[PDB]
């Protein structure tokens, strides 16, 4: 794959894993993000888990209009949290519009995992980037400039771990020559020790000239919340 | 050695956690190893045939256990994953 489909594969993997990192707390999972939010049930549950708030009763009815009602409850809830929904409609989610479903899940990740970040009076995506730059500043083999190419060799992720948890990782053993191995190391440590499920495909990140920045921001936001 | 036995015990404990089971490890019957060496990562895939008691009844199981080592990982000896656990 290249360009839009390559980024779609990355968003599908990472956004599915992020949703599952929350849904596990409610005793469930999704598998296929193009299918498993169409009825609105696990979308409403995801919003309850990440917000700690109660949404209206889900409708388990099998008809398209029941599912549109559920997705509208989800979208009404998201709008109530100050989110301006552009080019998102309940019918298109229920009808399995993959790009709109991914866009909706991104809007949820941004609102509930990134927007309220505040670092040195810098908010949201820019605050998260500033945090990453501050934490990795002394690691000369890291240069965080963005949420895409700066993360491809795995050293930024490994440096975030070393910076906070030097009991887990000997950063001195790492270099840029094994980007796939480095990403896998960060993900294996974070899954076992930081309760952050693996959300990237290391081969896909390393082999794409510019990886998907929404997927990378999603995963990096989990390190921010683990270490905050 | 202790290590093949330790991995078979890990397999039974992981199966017990995953399947809400109470299998009691008896012994390793046999082990096959497959090795890979990447730059820093080194991997062994263990194909373990083991005996365990299912309500006191001794039964044979095959467990697939993946053991991954990286020299930068210092919190534990390695990463271990049960991939498969089935009666044979």
What can you tell me about this protein's structure?
- The complex is a heterodimer of chains A (about 230) and B (about 90).
- Chain A is about 55% helix and about 0% strand.
- By secondary structure, chain A is mainly alpha-helical.
- Chain A has two domains: about 1-115, no CATH class; about 120-228, no CATH class.
- Chain A has helices spanning about 5-25, 40-50, 65-80, 90-95, 100-115, 125-135, 155-165, 180-195, 200-205, 215-225, and strands spanning about 120, 120-125.
- In chain A, a hairpin with a 2-residue loop joins strand 1 and strand 2 (about 120-125).
- In chain A, helix 1 (about 5-25) crosses helix 5.
- In chain A, strands 1-2 form a two-stranded antiparallel sheet.
- With about 90 residues, chain B is α+β, with helices and mostly antiparallel strands.
- Chain B has one domain (about 1-90).
- In chain B, strand 1 (about 25-35) and strand 2 (about 40-55) form a beta hairpin.
- Chain B starts with a helix and ends with a strand.
- The interface between A and B is medium-sized, with 18 and 13 residues.
- It is classed as contractile protein.
